[PDB]
Amino acid sequence: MAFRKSNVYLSLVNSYIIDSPQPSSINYWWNMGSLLGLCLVIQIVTGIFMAMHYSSNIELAFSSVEHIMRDVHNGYILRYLHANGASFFFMVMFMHMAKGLYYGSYRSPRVTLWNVGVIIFILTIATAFLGYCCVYGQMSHWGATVITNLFSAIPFVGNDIVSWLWGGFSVSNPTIQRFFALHYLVPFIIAAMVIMHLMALHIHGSSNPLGITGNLDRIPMHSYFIFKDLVTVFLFMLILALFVFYSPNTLGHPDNYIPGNPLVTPASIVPEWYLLPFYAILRSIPDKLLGVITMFAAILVLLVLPFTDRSVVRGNTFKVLSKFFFFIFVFNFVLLGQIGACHVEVPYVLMGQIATFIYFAYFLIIVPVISTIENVLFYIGRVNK
Amino acid sequence: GPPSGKTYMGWWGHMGGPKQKGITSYAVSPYAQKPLQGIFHNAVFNSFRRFKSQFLYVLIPAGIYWYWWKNGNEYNEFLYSKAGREELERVNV
Amino acid sequence: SLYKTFFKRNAVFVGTIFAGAFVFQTVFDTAITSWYENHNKGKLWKDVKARIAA
Amino acid sequence: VTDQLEDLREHFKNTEEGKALVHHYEECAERVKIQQQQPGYADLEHKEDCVEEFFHLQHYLDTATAPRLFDKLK
Amino acid sequence: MTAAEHGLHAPAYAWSHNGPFETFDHASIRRGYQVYREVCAACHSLDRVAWRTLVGVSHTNEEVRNMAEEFEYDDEPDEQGNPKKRPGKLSDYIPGPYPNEQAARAANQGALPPDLSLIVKARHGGCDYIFSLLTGYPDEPPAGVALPPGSNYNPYFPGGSIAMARVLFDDMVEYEDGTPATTSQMAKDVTTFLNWCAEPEHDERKRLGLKTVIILSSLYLLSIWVKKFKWAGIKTRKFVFNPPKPRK
Numbered sequence: 139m140a141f142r143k144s145n146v147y148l149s150l151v152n153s154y155i156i157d158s159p160q161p162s163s164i165n166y167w168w169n170m171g172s173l174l175g176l177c178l179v180i181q182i183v184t185g186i187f188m189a190m191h192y193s194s195n196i197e198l199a200f201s202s203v204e205h206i207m208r209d210v211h212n213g214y215i216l217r218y219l220h221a222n223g224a225s226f227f228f229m230v231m232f233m234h235m236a237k238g239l240y241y242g243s244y245r246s247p248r249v250t251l252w253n254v255g256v257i258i259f260i261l262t263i264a265t266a267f268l269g270y271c272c273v274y275g276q277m278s279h280w281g282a283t284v285i286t287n288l289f290s291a292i293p294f295v296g297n298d299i300v301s302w303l304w305g306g307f308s309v310s311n312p313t314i315q316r317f318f319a320l321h322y323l324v325p326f327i328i329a330a331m332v333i334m335h336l337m338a339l340h341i342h343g344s345s346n347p348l349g350i351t352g353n354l355d356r357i358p359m360h361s362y363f364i365f366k367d368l369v370t371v372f373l374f375m376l377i378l379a380l381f382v383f384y385s386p387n388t389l390g391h392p393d394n395y396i397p398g399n400p401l402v403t404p405a406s407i408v409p410e411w412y413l414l415p416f417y418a419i420l421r422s423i424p425d426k427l428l429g430v431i432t433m434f435a436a437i438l439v440l441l442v443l444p445f446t447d448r449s450v451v452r453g454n455t456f457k458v459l460s461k462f463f464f465f466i467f468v469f470n471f472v473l474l475g476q477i478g479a480c481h482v483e484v485p486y487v488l489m490g491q492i493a494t495f496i497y498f499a500y501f502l503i504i505v506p507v508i509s510t511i512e513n514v515l516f517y518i519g520r521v522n523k
Numbered sequence: 524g525p526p527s528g529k530t531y532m533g534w535w536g537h538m539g540g541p542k543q544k545g546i547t548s549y550a551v552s553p554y555a556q557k558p559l560q561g562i563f564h565n566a567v568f569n570s571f572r573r574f575k576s577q578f579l580y581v582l583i584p585a586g587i588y589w590y591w592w593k594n595g596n597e598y599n600e601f602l603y604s605k606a607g608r609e610e611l612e613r614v615n616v
Numbered sequence: 617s618l619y620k621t622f623f624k625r626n627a628v629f630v631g632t633i634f635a636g637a638f639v640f641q642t643v644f645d646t647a648i649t650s651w652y653e654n655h656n657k658g659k660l661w662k663d664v665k666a667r668i669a670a
Numbered sequence: 671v672t673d674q675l676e677d678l679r680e681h682f683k684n685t686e687e688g689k690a691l692v693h694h695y696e697e698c699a700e701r702v703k704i705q706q707q708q709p710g711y712a713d714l715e716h717k718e719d720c721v722e723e724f725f726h727l728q729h730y731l732d733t734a735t736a737p738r739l740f741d742k743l744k
Numbered sequence: 745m746t747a748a749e750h751g752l753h754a755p756a757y758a759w760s761h762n763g764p765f766e767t768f769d770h771a772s773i774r775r776g777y778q779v780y781r782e783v784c785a786a787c788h789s790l791d792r793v794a795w796r797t798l799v800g801v802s803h804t805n806e807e808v809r810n811m812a813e814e815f816e817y818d819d820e821p822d823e824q825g826n827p828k829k830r831p832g833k834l835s836d837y838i839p840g841p842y843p844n845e846q847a848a849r850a851a852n853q854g855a856l857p858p859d860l861s862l863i864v865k866a867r868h869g870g871c872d873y874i875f876s877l878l879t880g881y882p883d884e885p886p887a888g889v890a891l892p893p894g895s896n897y898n899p900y901f902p903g904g905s906i907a908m909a910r911v912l913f914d915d916m917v918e919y920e921d922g923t924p925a926t927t928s929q930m931a932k933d934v935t936t937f938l939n940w941c942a943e944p945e946h947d948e949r950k951r952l953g954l955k956t957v958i959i960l961s962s963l964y965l966l967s968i969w970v971k972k973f974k975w976a977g978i979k980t981r982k983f984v985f986n987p988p989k990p991r992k
């Protein structure tokens with residue numbers, strides 16, 4: 139045989155990106171997974187080169203980042219590609235998960251592939267939280283104060299988890315030094331989960347936008363989907379370059395250019411845009427212990443979808459009622475992000491409580507009821523009785 | 524190594540679908556075809572029906588949520604002005 | 617024929633895309649810098665120093 | 671040479687729209703002037719300002735002056 | 745919140761560095777430093793700017809050497825161990841007017857004037873907010889507003905009560921190139937100088953971005969042609985079904 143199939147290390151390359159059989163009818167939504175692999179390489183490589191110039195002491199952390207912007211050769215390119223690249227990583231990941239909801243990719247036999255992806259999403263959220271602390275701006279200090287104080291409401295162990303997380307009595311110098319060391323490590327755990335994610339995908343292959351079997355017409359990966367992947371790689375890099383060079387502070391907050399002061403509270407404490415819907419869910423529960431449980435339940439409720447979908451058809455292509463309620467769920471997610479950036483005022487308090495209910499009722503009430511009705515309408519529209 | 528478990532996809536030659544009989548296919552080399560014959564007859568009629576047979580599943584949920592956000596933003600603006608001062612003490616109870 | 621003198625011999629099809637890219641860097645950087653400075657004439661420091669000579 | 675921003679703000683306060691908004695601030699200014707000579711110095715918890723009328727005149731003058739001020743400056 | 749607690753919105757002015765192909769006006773930067781030395785520097789520090797960064801941007805090399813030699817800095821101690829002083833050099837940073845924070849609050853009635861090295865990027869509004877604050881002091885506050893003693897009215901400040909007074913008046917600075925120094929001219933120049941202090945890479949970043957966008961646009965348009973060429977055999981494929989004979 140050829141050397142790409144007989145060698146021990148090249149046969150893994152050949153069976154994944156060269157000779158792997160793809161369904162002939164997948165569209166451009168199936169290109170988001172390879173863009174996420176490019177984003178992870180960009181975040182790791184710009185991370186190492188900035189870490190050669192960074193100091194994690196609380197007296198030196200803010201001035202180290204200003205030293206990178208002013209004194210390091212091409213240092214402003216390294217930071218702006220890193221900060222804007224984190225926002226592009228979350229946008230591609232949101233579209234990748236929404237493709238899986240629409241086409242039914244979570245269903246059997248791909249449940250293990252969907253469960254490993256939910257773990258990856260949790261680790262990415264924790265990574266971006268720890269890197270934002272390392273700036274030690276004014277939004278960095280008070281955002282870490284709000285989130286770490288949530289864990290003291292846990293019964294019997296709460297007041298000792300928080301001081302074990304602080305290394306002291308508040309957010310201080312041991313907190314920033316341990317948060318930078320954890321920030322180095324978790325992207326390497328993410329890279330190992332991506333390898334386990336690709337092993338489960340190799341077993342069954344990909345789905346297709348019609349929802350039915352792809353075993354009857356396959357084309358190989360090399361020179362068809364390699365060149366289709368190049369179209370979205372160059373479009374991604376062009377839009378990212380327009381943000382890095384021409385508008386580099388649009389997706390950030392101007393309060394993060396003030397150094398962290400534990401005696402002055404800002405007028406508004408706002409997270410980054412990709413964490414705003416989970417911030418509005420937390421502020422809609424008045425009790426403090428039930429608010430942090432509901433905040434973590436908003437991620438873990440993705441695991442109930444293989445059991446609450448009752449349809450005998452995979453995907454949303456031929457279902458008009460499931461199409462309508464999918465886009466109700468999408469614009470509800472955008473509204474929750476907008477409520478999370480407002481003040482706690484009338485009428486945004488009641489609007490956030492209704493939108494929180496609609497988020498959880500989609501997974502647990504709407505999907506099993508609508509998919510049961512669509513099973514029966516397909517039957518009685520054909521059977522003569 | 525040991526043999527694996529039972530899956531629903533194979534490889535080239537044993538892919539795992541039904542048996543095929545009676546289907547013929549034809550194709551022409553890309554080197555013998557006309558170069559780039561799409562922007563027209565695809566932006567004429569094809570790239571309008573592909574979304575405007577689908578536009579009503581997107582814009583009815585978009586119009587519901589845009590009407591709800593715009594109505595709540597004008598009510599918050601009224602409550603913190605001079606004319607909406609008396610209603611503001613009533614609804615913060 | 618001009619396929620077989622430019623893109624057949626793939627000892628230099630890897631080569632010419634590796635050597636045409638070397639001279640490409642200096643001509644491209646000279647053309648943009650000249651356009652960028654002429655669009656902003658009268659505002660640079662060299663246009664200021666020429667009449668803060670006093 | 672006098673201040674160029676003061677000249678442009680003087681001109682647009684005497685347009686047909688500027689006379690209406692200068693007049694609306696003047697009627698609230700006397701309503702506070704009657705109000706501050708009764709019993710009611712430390713009373714009433716609800717004493718009035720003219721900030722909203724002042725903000726309406728400043729927002730009109732800003733959309734007229736700003737796209738044309740920097741042509742008059744070196 | 746009310747409109748007074750948020751602050752009045754700052755309008756958009758036609759700054760000559762707005763746009764993807766524009767640089768700073770370097771004559772406006774040079775006049776802006778003179779407004780800093782004669783007005784602002786009595787109470788504000790500029791701690792993140794070194795003397796060497798001004799060479800080739802607003803001043804010549806021997807002009808900056810004479811400017812830094814009018815301040816004295818700490819030196820290494822002598823052979824007995826007693827401290828010394830020395831005049832400044834190009835490696836030093838621009839010094840501030842106060843030794844510590846407690847001396848700064850004691851000179852300004854308890855208020856602390858912030859460092860201005862990053863003030864354009866640290867406020868919502870940017871150059872438009874800094875310009876509108878300086879030229880936006882009314883002669884008297886609106887009717888009803890009672891300021892505490894020691895504060896001043898400015899509608900662009902959130903809350904309306906600011907601890908700094910109006911500092912710019914007509915013809916308080918004599919310019920070198922002969923520009924008339926009105927209030928609007930001096931506020932425009934010092935805002936341009938403060939934007940360079942926050943973004944010194946600005947002229948280089950826009951030149952490097954033009955080369956990157958042109959190269960990445962060409963690679964995007966070429967990849968569409970190459971993908972459509974290599975897919976044309978699949979896209980025009982045809983199928984025909986003839987039902988097979990039974991009994992097999």
Ligand SMILES: CCCCCCCCCCC(=O)OC[C@H](COP(=O)(O)OC[C@H](O)COP(=O)(O)OC[C@@H](COC(=O)CC)OC(=O)CCC)OC(=O)CCCCCCCC
Nearest residue numbers: 164165166167169226229230369370373374377968971972
């Ligand atoms: C954020 C930074 C990441 C940047 C890169 C991410 C790209 C995300 C875009 C979303 C996506 O991936 O799905 C795209 C989908 C179309 O999928 P399809 O296979 O049915 O269309 C094949 C086409 O007919 C032939 O396309 P063809 O291959 O013939 O030509 C390529 C085309 C550009 O293609 C692309 O760039 C794909 C993104 O070139 C031209 O337009 C020629 C004129 C210059 O579009 C749709 O289904 C609906 C359209 C609107 C979607 C926008 C929603 C965004 C939230």
Ligand SMILES: CCCCCCCCCCCCCCCCCC(=O)OC[C@H](COP(=O)(O)OCCN)OC(=O)CCCCCCCCCCCCC
Nearest residue numbers: 167232233235236237240347348436455468471472573577
């Ligand atoms: C906990 C995490 C929760 C994650 C939630 C994620 C929410 C983030 C929002 C992501 C938006 C992605 C929506 C689209 C998802 C892709 C899947 C899909 O909807 O299919 C494409 C759809 C089908 O089109 P066809 O009918 O032609 O194809 C059928 C197959 N033969 O064709 C279409 O209709 C495409 C139309 C797309 C319009 C969507 C507008 C989204 C606006 C969001 C803006 C957000 C920033 C403000």
Ligand code: HEM
Nearest residue numbers: 181182185186188189192217221224266269270272273325
């Ligand atoms: C999946 C990978 C990563 C993500 C999502 C991520 C995210 C972030 C974010 C959001 C910030 C704050 C940026 C800002 O607003 O200024 C940050 C800062 C930082 N990160 Fe990362 N990061 C990743 C990987 C890494 C790695 C692997 C390293 C080091 C080896 C690293 C080193 C740094 C440093 C030094 C900073 C501070 C400098 C700065 O503010 O840009 N990052 N990171």
Ligand code: HEM
Nearest residue numbers: 168169170171172174175235238243252255256259344345
């Ligand atoms: C760094 C993060 C990730 C990487 C690198 C990655 C990579 C990939 C790749 C390359 C594919 C195959 C091509 C494609 O369908 O796009 C894929 C498929 C898939 N991924 Fe991911 N992924 C990531 C995160 C996630 C997340 C967060 C989820 C869900 C919560 C997820 C769920 C899935 C599913 C269900 C499929 C199968 C889709 C189908 O067959 O139709 N992945 N992934």
Ligand code: HEM
Nearest residue numbers: 783784786787852855856857858863905906907908911934
């Ligand atoms: C042209 C000269 C000056 C400029 C451009 C300037 C600039 C600024 C800026 C941008 C602020 C921040 C406002 C904000 O927080 O939004 C500020 C605050 C302040 N400045 Fe000035 N400054 C100047 C001169 C002065 C002078 C001469 C004094 C004192 C005699 C002074 C004292 C203060 C004080 C006390 C504050 C804090 C006010 C507060 O927080 O309420 N400044 N200045």
Ligand SMILES: COc1c(O)c(C)c(C/C=C(\C)CC/C=C(\C)CC/C=C(\C)CC/C=C(\C)CC/C=C(\C)CCC=C(C)C)c(O)c1OC
Nearest residue numbers: 154155158171172175179182183186329332336339340344
């Ligand atoms: C269904 O069919 C498919 C399919 O459709 C796709 C898209 C893929 C696509 C595959 C991918 C997208 C690969 C996934 C991406 C990763 C696993 C990236 C992992 C990240 C790393 C390995 C990061 C490592 C980075 C470094 C080591 C850089 C370190 C920096 C250094 C050394 C600085 C240099 C130091 C000095 C001193 C100069 C398939 O494999 C596949 O088959 C299953």
Ligand SMILES: CCCCCCCCCCCCCCCCCC(=O)O[C@H](COC(=O)CCCCCC)COP(=O)(O)OCCN
Nearest residue numbers: 141142143144145146147148149150151152329330333334
């Ligand atoms: C932690 C995740 C691990 C993921 C593994 C992914 C695989 C990554 C490999 C990427 C491609 C590497 C190309 C290897 C080149 C061919 C291998 C080879 O030359 O083997 C040998 C020679 O031995 C070597 O010198 C090994 C070189 C070390 C390579 C370290 C990078 C070729 O000779 P051989 O005839 O034995 O090959 C048949 C093997 N079954």
Ligand SMILES: CO/C=C(/C(=O)OC)c1ccccc1Oc1cc(Oc2ccccc2C#N)ncn1
Nearest residue numbers: 266267270271278281282408409410413416417433
């Ligand atoms: C250090 O501050 C980090 C912030 C940030 O945005 O990081 C990227 C932040 C800033 C201000 C306010 C809050 C901030 O952090 C966060 C953190 C956060 O975390 C979760 C997200 C989803 C589910 C659970 C949690 C938690 N805890 N959800 C929302 N905001």
